[PDB]
Every structure is written in C-alpha cells, then in structure tokens.
Amino acid sequence: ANFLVHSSNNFGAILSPTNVGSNTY
Amino acid sequence: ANFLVHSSNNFGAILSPTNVGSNTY
Amino acid sequence: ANFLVHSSNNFGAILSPTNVGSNTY
Amino acid sequence: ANFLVHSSNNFGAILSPTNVGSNTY
Amino acid sequence: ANFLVHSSNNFGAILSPTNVGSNTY
Amino acid sequence: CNTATCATQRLANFLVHSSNNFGAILSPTNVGSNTY
Amino acid sequence: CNTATCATQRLANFLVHSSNNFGAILSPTNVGSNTY
Amino acid sequence: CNTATCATQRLANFLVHSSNNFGAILSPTNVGSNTY
Amino acid sequence: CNTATCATQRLANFLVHSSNNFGAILSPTNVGSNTY
C-alpha cells in the first residue's frame, strides 16, 4: 500500500482517521 | 492500494474517516 | 484500488466516511 | 476501482458516506 | 507499505490518527 | 467585531489584462468559519 | 476586534498582466477560523 | 485587537507582469485560527 | 494589540516580472494562531 502526499498548505487531516477503533495502514 | 494526494490548501479531511469502527487502508 | 486527489481548496470531506461501522479501503 | 478527484473548492462530501454500516472501497 | 510526504506548509495532520485504539503502520 | 469571526477581503483600484487562460484569475475564497 | 477572530486581507492599486495561464493568478484564501 | 486573533495581510501599489504560468501567482492565505 | 495574537504581513510598492513559472510566485501565508 503506497502512500504519496504533496501538501502545499494543510490545515486539516490528510490520512489521519479520528476517533476510530482498530486502525491499520 | 496506491494513494496519491496533491492538496493545495486543505481545511478538512481528505482520506481520514471519523467516528468509525475497524478501519483498514 | 488506486486513489488520486487534486484538491485546490478543501473545507469538507473527500474520501473520509463519518459515523460508519467496519470501513476498508 | 480507480478514484479521481479534482476538487476546486469543496465544502461538503465527495466520496465520504455518512451514518452507514459496513463500508468498503 | 511505502510512505512518501512532500509537505510545503503543514498546519494539521498528515498520517497521524488521533484518539484511536490499536494503530499499526 | 465583538466575539465574532469576521473574515474580510478587499480588492480595489486594479487592472487585470489576460490573453489566454485555462484556470481562475480572480476567485478569492472567504470563509467566516469552518466547523468539522 | 474584541475577542473576535477577524482575519483580513487587502489588495489595492495594482496591475496584473498575463499572456498565457493554466492556474490561478488571483485567488487569495481568507478563513476566519477552522475548527476540527 | 483585544484578546482576538486578528491575522492580517496587505498587498498594495504593485505591478505583476506574467507571460506563461502553470501555478498560482497571487494566492495569499490568511487564517485567523486553526483548531485541531 | 492587547493580549491578542495579531500576526501581520505587508507587501507594497514592488514589481514582479515572470516569463515561465511552474509554482507559486506570491503566496504568502498568514496564520494568527495554530492550536493542536
């Protein structure tokens, strides 16, 4: 599972789940 | 599962589920 | 499952389910 | 299942189901 | 699972889940 | 403003000349508040 | 401003000349507040 | 400003000349506050 | 400013000439406060 992010000006989430149970990448 | 993000100016979620159970990428 | 996002100015969700059960990408 | 998003100015959901059961991409 | 980030000006999360249970990369 | 998120922008007394264009040239975005 | 997030921007008395363009040239973003 | 996050920017009395462009040339970002 | 995070920037009386560009040329970022 390849992940690529080219963020210029981030103010929130990108690949970041919130209030979850079992999380896996 | 390839992920690509080119975010210019983010203020919310992109690939980030909220209030979920078992999450997997 | 390939994912591509070119977000210019995001203020909400893109690929981020909310209040779900078992989520998988 | 290929996903492509070119969002200019988002204020709501795009590919983000809400209040669902078992979700899969 | 390869991870790549090219962040220009970050103010939020990128690959950082919050308030989760068992997290694994 | 009193206890009020009052984001403002102003553009004035300018001139924009374009010959060919494929995207926005004047699309400022103003958001008072974003709750998630 | 009193206890108020009052983000402001101003553009004035300028001139922008363009010949070919594929992206934004004047799209400033103003956000009073972002709650996540 | 009194107890108020009051971020401001100003652009004035300038001239921008462009011939070919593929990205932004004037897209300043102003955010009063970002809560996460 | 009184007890207020009041970040400011100013650009004035300048001239920018460009011929080919693939990224931003004037995209200053102003953030009053960032809480995480």
Added chain:
Amino acid sequence: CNTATCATQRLANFLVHSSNNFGAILSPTNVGSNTY
C-alpha cells in the same frame, strides 16, 4: 503590543524579475503562535 504575540513582516520598494521558475519566489510565512 501588550502581552500579545504580534509577529509581523514587511516587504516594500523592491523589484523581482524572473525568467523561469519551478518553485515559490515570494511566499513568506507569518504565524502568530503555534500551540501543540
């Protein structure tokens, strides 16, 4: 400023000439405060 983080920057009376560019040329960053 009184008990206030009041970061400021100023750019004035300058001239920028560019011929080819792939990144930012004027993108100053101003942050009043960053809480983590």
